[PDB]
Amino acid sequence: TINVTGDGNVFKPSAETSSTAVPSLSLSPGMLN
Amino acid sequence: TINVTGDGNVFKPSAETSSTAVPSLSLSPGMLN
Amino acid sequence: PGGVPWIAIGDETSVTSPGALRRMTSKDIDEPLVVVTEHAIANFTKAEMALEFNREFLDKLRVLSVSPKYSDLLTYVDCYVGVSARQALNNFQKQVPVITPTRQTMYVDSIQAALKALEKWEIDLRVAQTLLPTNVPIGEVSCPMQSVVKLLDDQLPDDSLIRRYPKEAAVALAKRNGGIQWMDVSEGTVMNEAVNAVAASALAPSASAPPLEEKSKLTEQAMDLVTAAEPEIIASLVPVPAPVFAIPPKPADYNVRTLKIDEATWLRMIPKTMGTLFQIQVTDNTGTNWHFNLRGGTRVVNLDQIAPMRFVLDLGGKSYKETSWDPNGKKVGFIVFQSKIPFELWTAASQIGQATVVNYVQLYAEDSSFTAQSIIATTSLAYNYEPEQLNKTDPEMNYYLLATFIDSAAITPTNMTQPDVWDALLTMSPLSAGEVTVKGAVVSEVVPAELIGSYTPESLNASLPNDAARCMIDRASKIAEAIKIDDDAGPDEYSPNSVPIQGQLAISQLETGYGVRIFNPKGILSKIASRAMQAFIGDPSTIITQAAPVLSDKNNWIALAQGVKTSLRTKSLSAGVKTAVSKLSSSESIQNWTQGFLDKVSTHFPAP
Amino acid sequence: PGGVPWIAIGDETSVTSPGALRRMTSKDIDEPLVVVTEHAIANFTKAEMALEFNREFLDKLRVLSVSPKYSDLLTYVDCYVGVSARQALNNFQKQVPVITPTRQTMYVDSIQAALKALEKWEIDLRVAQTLLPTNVPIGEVSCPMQSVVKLLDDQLPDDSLIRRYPKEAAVALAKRNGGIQWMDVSEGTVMNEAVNAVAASALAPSASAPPLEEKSKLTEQAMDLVTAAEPEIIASLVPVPAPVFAIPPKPADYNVRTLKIDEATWLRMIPKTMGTLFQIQVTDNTGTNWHFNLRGGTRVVNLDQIAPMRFVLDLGGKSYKETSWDPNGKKVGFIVFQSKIPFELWTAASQIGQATVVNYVQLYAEDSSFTAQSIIATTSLAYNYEPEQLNKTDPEMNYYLLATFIDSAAITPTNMTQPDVWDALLTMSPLSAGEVTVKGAVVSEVVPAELIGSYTPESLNASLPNDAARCMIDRASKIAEAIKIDDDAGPDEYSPNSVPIQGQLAISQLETGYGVRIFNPKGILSKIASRAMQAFIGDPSTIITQAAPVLSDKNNWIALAQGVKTSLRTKSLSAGVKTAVSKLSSSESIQNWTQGFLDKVSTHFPAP
Amino acid sequence: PGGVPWIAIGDETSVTSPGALRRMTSKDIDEPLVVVTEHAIANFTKAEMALEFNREFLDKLRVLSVSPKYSDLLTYVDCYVGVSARQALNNFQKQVPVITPTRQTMYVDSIQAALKALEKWEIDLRVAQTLLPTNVPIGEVSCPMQSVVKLLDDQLPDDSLIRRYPKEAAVALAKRNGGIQWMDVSEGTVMNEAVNAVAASALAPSASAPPLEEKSKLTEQAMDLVTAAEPEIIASLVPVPAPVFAIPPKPADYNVRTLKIDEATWLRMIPKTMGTLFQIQVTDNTGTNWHFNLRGGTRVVNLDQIAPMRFVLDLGGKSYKETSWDPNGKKVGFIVFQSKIPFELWTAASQIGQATVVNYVQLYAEDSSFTAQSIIATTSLAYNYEPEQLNKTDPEMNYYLLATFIDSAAITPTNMTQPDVWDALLTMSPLSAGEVTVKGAVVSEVVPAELIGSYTPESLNASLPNDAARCMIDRASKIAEAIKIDDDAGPDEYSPNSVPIQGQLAISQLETGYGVRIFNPKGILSKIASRAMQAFIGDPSTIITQAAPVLSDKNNWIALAQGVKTSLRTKSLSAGVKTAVSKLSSSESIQNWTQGFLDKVSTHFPAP
Amino acid sequence: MEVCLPNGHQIVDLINNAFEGRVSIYSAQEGWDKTISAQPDMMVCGGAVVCMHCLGVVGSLQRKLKHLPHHRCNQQIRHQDYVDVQFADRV
Ligand SMILES: CCCCCCCCO[C@@H]1O[C@H](CO)[C@@H](O)[C@H](O)[C@H]1O
Ligand SMILES: CCCCCCCCO[C@@H]1O[C@H](CO)[C@@H](O)[C@H](O)[C@H]1O
Ligand SMILES: CCCCCCCCO[C@@H]1O[C@H](CO)[C@@H](O)[C@H](O)[C@H]1O
Ligand SMILES: [Cl-]
Ligand SMILES: [Zn+2]
């Protein structure tokens, strides 16, 4: 229910909103036990 | 209420008391979520 | 906990589809909300501590008296939790730490603003802690606190904030160094004011073991090396895509004239003793015509199949001075030919196909240390071989690169007799890190294990900068580096990293093969394995070198490459026996040194 | 939780100022106390496990039967918590894990003392796990446990503790390798005794994906590289302080004689063809007088503005043999001049200002491979240029460095005609990592982006070891290394790391400029971008090289440098498609190899 | 929690010995069970999030609609916990997260299978986020969302999944980039849909400080370097076992002919001017006889005591052309002698003891740039010196290595007059990383501190590839690298990493020694210290170089090496003042650049 | 003991020697002395010691050999497959 081609959309990249997903986690053997 | 120039002060560096503050923490994106 | 807070769109509990949910916002306790993770809480809290180490100073500075306290800004809420609606839908949670972006930002900005204020105090305080030894590797050391302050007072920079807030500095230090204690003038009491006893416990040696943090870190650094090497790739027995196998390459040097054409498969040459000699003319991309001769001895680089490559020629130091030819003021250039006729067969100008002088420089000569000889100034004649630019279509097309003297006037064959100016330093640099070659030509994939022991010293030296062997060697050396971080074995001593080879050797001499069989006792196989591993660590290229004692066999390589993973992963905060003693022995000598220095301090800044 | 425990100095609850608090001590449950963090608890507990992996052995060894158990020494207390009083003052906590330094130390010393005991057992046990394959990259492999023990028995070192405690070793292994199971003689039962199933799940491949730990680690290693490169610094468009921009430099080699003075701005030369020639005399710092000649051709290094620098000259291999001059036994030296007159203008001894022979060595010559030529032995004539020692005051003062033959006897001009002994190998090493130069002269700050595409090959080669370009290149290569860890793109294939350039190119060809405009479809811009990125990864110096196809434009550089951050940070435990298949394909071949070996084992050590 | 679940073998509570316990299995709630750690729970949960970032796509793809949810497969149980029985015996726990291996695997396989499905979508989505700037270093930037989509549509690869699921891509992006928001057509509402506000807060700059993640990471990277250098080892004042001290070595080049025998202690030579000359005959390991001459000038390598070593000789570029001798077609070889007579004393064939031609190659010559000279093609004559293979027994036995012309026909002394073919490029590579030498000979242990300032440039250059100095230098440079990551001090400015030296200097000038004493104010000692540190960072080899200003003193070295540990460890998420401003200043310029680009985008893809 | 094939330049060297009658041949019967003909077991090809039964490198000139080294030999190189070289060298 959004229009990729519509108005009212927002493209304001900012330092506070640095995109990130899940690059790496803590999976070493000694830590997972 | 201490005297930097007074007696009774102690200067005994030891392995057990290795000075440390907060050099680094775990701030990776995937970990902070 | 983690993700975002979701609330039932309108109907309490009767929530069923992901549609029945909506991003819980601030207007439910108008920014959207975010789950503050267990991790985030623990770490940002530790950030606050960073400020509290200098509380006494911060206040005496009348700034940020309101210590941030993260747990304060958090708002616990019951709700559905998840990154998506669906996930959230089947995950209701009670007491979820939540916060709005703006508040999270406002919080961090308070911590950062504070750190910015501590900016200099942070430095001046560290300067005080390193001007003289404030710590010791093992044991304990002492010095008249008054002598210490005398010293600081005599050496600290004038602008040090410590000179302006001595007492605050005192607390600050005592707050982080259990060894620095200030007596309470009030109760004549004196004690450890440090807040980091737990941390320091991991950084100190026990009566016979190095610090746990050290043993842990080093072993971690060995494993990261092994992971970066990629055991599965370098020990693979099946093909591996070039892009996947390759890594950032390094340049290589050659003197095209001194290479052996039966070793460097990328060179072609016009046979001497045939009286072959013919003058030709070629233009550069600006239409300017150039003159030069091809004759017996002339060499060229067979561009086809070498992958993107940059060439840079340095005629510096060379002579080329002949009875009727002075290199000074002359010009050299790179010419790229496109012909269907093999270069070795050339004898007439008609066979050169399409040619273009792609670059040229004018030479400057002077007198060298060698009498009667002229020395040419350093050059950097460059040419980038971009396969896509040439656009080879006709399979019978050959692409050649030449470096000779070019001139605006026909070059008299009896004046300048050199075949080319390839007797120079040539530096090749790959213009791609996704293509790999094997002994001169591109390959779409590599079989790492077959590289083992298949290169002679001659062949390796002649390989192109993007040769699979060279790459194998750089990946392998990370393994060698890893083994050395963990292995302190001396000559002929076995170890967890040498036995993998021993195992292969043990079975190998039993396998039915051909030739005179030999039987070595475990004790001798153990040594041979040790030496093999040492040779590998001292010269990783031995694995791709022909007839290299033990590393020349792909089985011993695979066993080692794969073994290391197990060798490291099954360790328990351990350190080599030999190492453990050496560390403690050394830590003691440093501790002793530390004391001897502190004594000199006490002597030159006597306590009252 | 974290920090230190604080108790109300005397008044229950009526605590208000930070003064109303005091460091809670042991005498409240006479050492001070410390908060044991959530983190410290979790990790030291995992340390204990390190000992329990060998419980069976430890006990059979009658040592530390009392397994440490950290949570036991902890003492939970209600109190105010914080690093400082103020922070603590507004943070009351219930059930805070607390401990005294002495007890924390006593605890760790118990764990360490235990590990010290396991010292050898740890090694012998790993030796058993790597002698033959104890693991496999993917899938599963098998071998008659009896054949395996047969092998071990035939190969393990005599002094192995495993030979002395076979059954304990069995448990030990089974405790960490789910693949090693010992049947219970009692109930004919057999099963996984390993305690690390969770951990191993992260180290294993799924039917079509590499291990999660691997994907995570590698991506982490790419990001650390990008962070160490400092995107904001290398892509900066405004000035950056030299100290901040610089990094540990590397040495560089030159042959001052073959450099082009219109390329190396730090060299000066007396013009030839002017009949310039004059003998002078200079003393060394011990008052000894030396003779040498300056004439047409003589070159010197203009010391001013090159920053702290060490020079080392190697005349090894050179001749300098003339009809009436034999280098054997002669002496060469470094002379530093201080004059107001420009070197090019010198013709009489009166213009040299203040001169000192700062160092000299005696040469040894022999016969070289080249007939009639003498070959000089290797030299290491050194000179450290420390600007502060010279103390330039008069702005019209020039500082020059020369390298010639010096002698106790006047050097007859017609005997030794060389202008200097600069036709040698000169190695420069910066004596500072806080100063940077640009094409020969020092600059207080750099504008990274303007370095892009402004160096010719000639200029780069002539730059000093502390040149900004060289530095830019070493920082940039960390980016190249990062992109390669993540990118497995083949020739002309787009990728998350190539498109940033494509974007700049897409807009660039639309921007109104000057010259004949061209329009390339997305498909072609995509390729050009790919090749640019490959050229960068294969030769990071292309970004500071003039006319370098696409990387020569500062916009494409900035887009790439900054893009990589986003490219990596928005990944989700992923791995390249091409890579994913290659890894599994390779893991399988290794698994197969592992089996084939285990078979040979079974064959040469048959089970009963 | 961690380890494995243990249940009372048969008797409730009356459990006393470790025997009274048994591995709790699935048949108690037939696989064994494992404790799922607090850590494992937190991280695998975060793994699930990886999938949920693309929930909208995954469902529209009709795959894994059942989001894994780890906490679901966990089974909480009351039991005894531990890796061993004993430990478990005294550790009863309530509500222990437990799981069977098979279920843990089944779980991870669900997450991996999912990621495999996201394989391409993951890439196409990142490609969309880097095609144009999706982020900015500091501040904020904007662009007509319609212009952005116009651009993407004009540039994204045809096969991009984004072109097939635009709306899903929208959500996906908005889910990770708070800056990308899609208006709800329904309520004209628009807002941040990102789920990573907390994370991003650590990656952003505050008004005057760089990101906390950056400051943290960099400082962490400096510490890892210091740990890898091993402060206790490189600053040790007592002996350290060679194996422990050594690290992976690098090759070294020499021209045996140009070395000074009073500098390279591993060379021997037959004195010239004695008319010494004698022809000998030696066979190779295939029984073939060879001829060659030894005479005045002939040099050899004294193999004894140099440790495992590989030699490779390159005669490329050399001439060796004489009136009656042409190198073209001739042969050179490596001969290893075993004699009790010192080499210098040889004059007759009878003194050479046991000799063997261990390797040989045939040379190819052509014409060089130098007229009248012939240029020999590149060679790679190799020889591996393995001490164990020679098996030296008799202490009076000397082991020598020679490189000369060998021929099947006696070599006429007046035709080929060269003493050997050592005027070539020799490359030595250690065949072991567990042995170390000091100035030519092996040593079983090293005293790091005594290496300080004991090498002249000549001596360092002549040392073998496995020399302790060379190693000391590579370990030390990790320290230099570390200091530079943290220090942004300009010329003559003090810092936490320079003062350690200042302290030593301060006391040193007070110590009673010998010679004319001098007193420098703190201000000057501060500078001298700064310069010393800079010289060290710019050229780490200065510490082992003789008379090197301040680093030549072992005390200043130890103070620095040990100081750095304290300098870094006492930091609090801080960054240099000079750096902090530069970073923000640069981030701003990039932000500005980002905007300027987005404008061009808006201009060439106008919004409706 | 896996073995690899020799490199191109080493075979070129074998040929060059053959036409000078100096190929170093080893036979179990006569050892390294080729005065008396016997079927080759090993030949030296540009430094490498090659097995004439599989053409694999089983050694080098550096370490002396008294017998044909025990190796995993494919044994598919027949005498007829290299006799032309042996003939050239002996003649
Ligand atoms: C934490 C302990 C720090 C000790 C450093 C003490 C530095 C002394 O500092 C000096 O103190 C004098 C007396 O107040 C002043 O008169 C001087 O101006 C001041 O520089
Ligand atoms: C964990 C499994 C380890 C298997 C290694 C077994 C090594 C066998 O060790 C051998 O056992 C014999 C019978 O007890 C003894 O007589 C030998 O002295 C001993 O060396
Ligand atoms: C997350 C925002 C993604 C914006 C990318 C939009 C890419 C547009 O994609 C285009 O959309 C057109 C209209 O549906 C189709 O006709 C085209 O075939 C399709 O390629
Ligand atoms: Cl962590
Ligand atoms: Zn064979």
Short mmCIF file of N, CA, C and O and ligand atoms in Angstrom, two decimals, chain A residues 26 31, chain B residues 26 31, chain C residues 39, chain D residues 39, chain E residues 39, ligand 4:
data_model
loop_
_atom_site.label_atom_id
_atom_site.label_comp_id
_atom_site.label_asym_id
_atom_site.label_seq_id
_atom_site.Cartn_x
_atom_site.Cartn_y
_atom_site.Cartn_z
N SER A 26 28.77 -12.57 17.11
CA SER A 26 29.80 -13.21 17.92
C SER A 26 29.56 -14.72 17.92
O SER A 26 28.77 -15.22 18.71
N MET A 31 32.85 -18.87 23.00
CA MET A 31 31.75 -18.04 23.46
C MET A 31 30.41 -18.75 23.41
O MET A 31 29.58 -18.57 24.31
N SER B 26 32.08 -3.44 22.77
CA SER B 26 31.51 -4.18 21.65
C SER B 26 30.38 -3.36 21.03
O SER B 26 29.24 -3.41 21.48
N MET B 31 25.55 -6.68 16.61
CA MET B 31 25.45 -6.97 18.04
C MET B 31 24.50 -6.02 18.76
O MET B 31 23.76 -6.44 19.66
N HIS C 39 22.40 -6.45 24.81
CA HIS C 39 23.77 -6.08 24.46
C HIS C 39 23.95 -4.55 24.51
O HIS C 39 24.85 -4.05 25.20
N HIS D 39 29.22 -9.66 32.23
CA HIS D 39 30.20 -10.14 31.26
C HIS D 39 31.28 -10.99 31.92
O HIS D 39 31.52 -12.13 31.52
N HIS E 39 24.79 -16.69 25.72
CA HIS E 39 25.42 -16.12 24.53
C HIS E 39 24.81 -16.69 23.26
O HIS E 39 24.34 -15.95 22.40
CL CL G 4 32.07 -10.02 21.97
#
